[PDB]
Design a protein around this nucleic acid. Structure first.
Ligand SMILES: [Mg+2]
Ligand SMILES: [Mg+2]
Ligand SMILES: [Zn+2]
Length: 494
RNA sequence: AAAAGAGUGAACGAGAGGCUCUUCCAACUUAGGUUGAAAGAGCACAGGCUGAGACAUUCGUAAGGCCGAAAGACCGGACGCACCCUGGGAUUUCCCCAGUCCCCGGAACUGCAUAGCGGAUGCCAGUUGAUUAUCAGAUAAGCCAGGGGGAACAAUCACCUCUCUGUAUCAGAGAGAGUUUUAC
DNA sequence: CTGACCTCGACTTCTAGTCTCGTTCACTCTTTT
DNA sequence: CGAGACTAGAAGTCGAGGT
């Protein structure tokens, strides 16, 4: 039934055992030591032979649903897994990091220099300068001081560079392979190959010549295409294009393609982006879309690098397999549809003489990936200026900020009398900070009952102590009565 | 090689908002207080590194072309710079990395000519301690800071059978050789 | 004459979090010619 | 093949008790 994994005296993985009673005998006799709860790994204390057999590992890639399965010389499955990768959160985190540091450089460095320049009299006589930097054709506006040097002309990268998200997914695949190697003797590795065309899957029955001329053929960039389809004037008025607005904001999964961008003048952008009626009107004229091809892009980028480095890890014992071959295998041997039986079929592909092939039974070991680091310090810099009459909210700022659909103080001031303004009470709460030394998700803790769990969330804080620890199963444990056993493991088995 | 498709990394610039304070006006209230309009000033993850580097005006920034009375304009790209390259550093850690930035040099690659860099004048800091001199302190219009992986740390007994409890399930507790082999 | 109606640990429920553009640049992968 | 949520803090329940 449930296979038990074995390791020798030396740190060498070894063929898994299934007797399941000899294991308890060896454990009670001191011959065996437990190494991992789940999967249940035992390390022999007494020395013995190390005679192993080849095992084929089969990999079904992905961005959030990686899956690997291990099989013997014949079609017997000794390991099945599923992985939920943290990958999707990396692009958003890097985006927010860029925005935060741009804020840092603007507000602490740039604006402070401009302020000092105006104070000390060492500012432009015009008070503003148009500077045409090398590499661009339209100037920039430098107010009261020259800009800090801009570096975009020449920034070479090592060939084969990969973005932090794609590099993260590559590292995650390889890391899960290493963790599987720690458990079992893996001889061959079989990686599924996925190549995607995103001109395809948008329109099947695509004709060959269509691949070269698409929505943005000839017309240079998305901005120019929008300025063309709108005839060079704002979408609302007859005024010229100023800002290229996203119909779906980039804070959501707003696409960067053509069907999302729209040209608008200044005032029209401000109104459509603060007011509600204008937003509804623009949503009426055009719809926009999400990204819809953010995952498969990263997967397609990393597949060749993964195949290369798998070949490095398993010299002379690395193969490949097509998704179509997997589908044929499922149709042939009757494997049910799933997203982890894919790995079993992929592994079974390489088997030259497979006569015991049958579908695995039992749920596979699920793996969650948790942050290895979190170096943020501010939880909620509130930045909102709330006005109340009595105990009811009536305005959220003095004047509307960008993306403020709700009223502000100027509109209330217009609508009501000066007595109502004189009878307002303001409450603006201060900034909240995370505890950067807190116990992080993925840690292994034990509660008052002695139950062992993996910390998934920390919820609620009072007087400097967490209130609740939420395990991966969603159970909530009182934080004061829980004991800290193990730190964050990069990938945690559930 | 090109045209497209899809992603996601980098530098620089403007705002809408936000915090604190000053002046002034208005409203509402026990001269005071509260809210607001207007003008101005300062400030902007928690923090690490460093002691100068930010700013304005002006001069200079190769050969060779080419047009100009000339001044000088355009091309070009070095004996000028660099985001480029070798080495060394800050962020930097339990071990690393990405990104940004810095310092002496610059050979091939790469990029710039209104940019960068250097010079000159001007403007913006700190000055205390232990033995004029040396080690400490103070000194921002300086750099970085919300990215990622790994190691190590269990109250680490899985499966099945049997018993007890509760529990609709199943959980907890206890006890058990259930094929010899964890490999033939 | 309590005691019915407070006061206080100690938990349990629940909600909320910044956002626009502008001048450029770089890397990866796929599909057709 | 895949498109928020972890963490901090305020308001709320509730028993002990107690006066
Ligand atoms: Mg597949
Ligand atoms: Mg907009
Ligand atoms: Zn207009």
């Amino acid at each position: 039934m449930a296979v038990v994994y074995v390791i020798s005296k030396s740190g060498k993985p070894l063929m898994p055992t299934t007797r399941c009673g000899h294991v308890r005998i060896l454990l009670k006799e001191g011959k065996a030591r437990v190494v991992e709860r789940k999967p249940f790994t035992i390390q022999l204390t007494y020395e013995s032979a190390e005679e192993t057999q080849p095992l084929v590992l089969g990999i079904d890639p992905g961005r959030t649903n990686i899956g690997m399965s291990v099989v013997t010389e014949s079609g017997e499955s000794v390991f099945n897994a599923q992985i939920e990768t943290r990958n999707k959160d990396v692009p958003k985190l890097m985006k927010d990091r860029k925005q935060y540091r741009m804020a840092h450089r603007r507000l602490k460095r740039r604006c402070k220099r401009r302020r000092r320049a105006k104070a000390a009299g060492t500012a432009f006589e015009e008070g503003e300068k148009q500077r045409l930097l090398p590499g661009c054709f339209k100037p920039i506006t430098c107010k009261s001081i020259r800009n800090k040097e801009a570096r975009f002309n020449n920034r070479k990268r090592p060939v084969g560079w990969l973005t932090p998200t794609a590099n993260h997914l590559l590292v995650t695949h390889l890391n899960v392979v290493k963790k599987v190697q720690k458990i079992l003797p893996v001889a061959k590795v079989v990686l599924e190959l996925n190549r995607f065309s995103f001109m395809a899957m948008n329109n099947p029955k695509v004709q060959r010549w269509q691949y070269q001329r698409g929505p943005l053929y000839g017309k240079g960039s998305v901005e120019e295409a929008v300025s063309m389809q709108q005839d060079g004037h704002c979408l609302f008025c007859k005024h010229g294009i100023d800002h290229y607005h996203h119909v779906v904001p980039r804070r959501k999964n707003g696409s960067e393609t053509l069907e999302n961008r729209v040209g608008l003048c200044e005032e029209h952008h401000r109104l459509v982006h603060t007011d509600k009626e204008w937003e509804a009107n623009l949503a009426s004229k055009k719809s926009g879309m999400n990204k819809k091809y953010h995952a498969l892009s990263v997967l397609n980028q990393i597949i060749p690098y993964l195949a290369d480095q798998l070949a490095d890890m398993f010299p002379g014992n690395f193969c490949v397999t097509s998704g179509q071959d997997t589908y044929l295998f499922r149709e042939e041997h009757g494997i049910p549809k799933d997203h982890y039986l894919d790995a079993y079929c992929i592994a079974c592909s390489a088997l030259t003489d497979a006569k015991k092939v049958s579908s695995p039974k039992g749920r596979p070991y699920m793996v969650h990936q948790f942050r290895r680091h979190d170096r943020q310090a501010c939880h909620k810099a509130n930045l909102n200026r709330s006005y109340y009459m009595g105990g009811k909210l009536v305005a959220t700022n003095r004047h509307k900020a960008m993306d403020q659909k709700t009223d502000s103080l100027e509109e209330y001031r217009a609508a009501h009398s000066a007595a109502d303004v004189s009878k307002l009470t303001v409450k603006h709460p201060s900034a909240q900070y995370k505890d950067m030394s807190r116990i992080m998700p993925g840690s292994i803790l034990v509660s008052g009952e002695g139950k062992l769990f993996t910390l998934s969330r920390s919820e609620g804080r009072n007087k400097g102590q967490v209130n609740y620890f939420v395990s991966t199963e969603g159970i909530k444990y009182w934080a004061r009565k829980c004991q800290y056993l193990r730190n964050n493991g990069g990938l945690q088995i559930y």
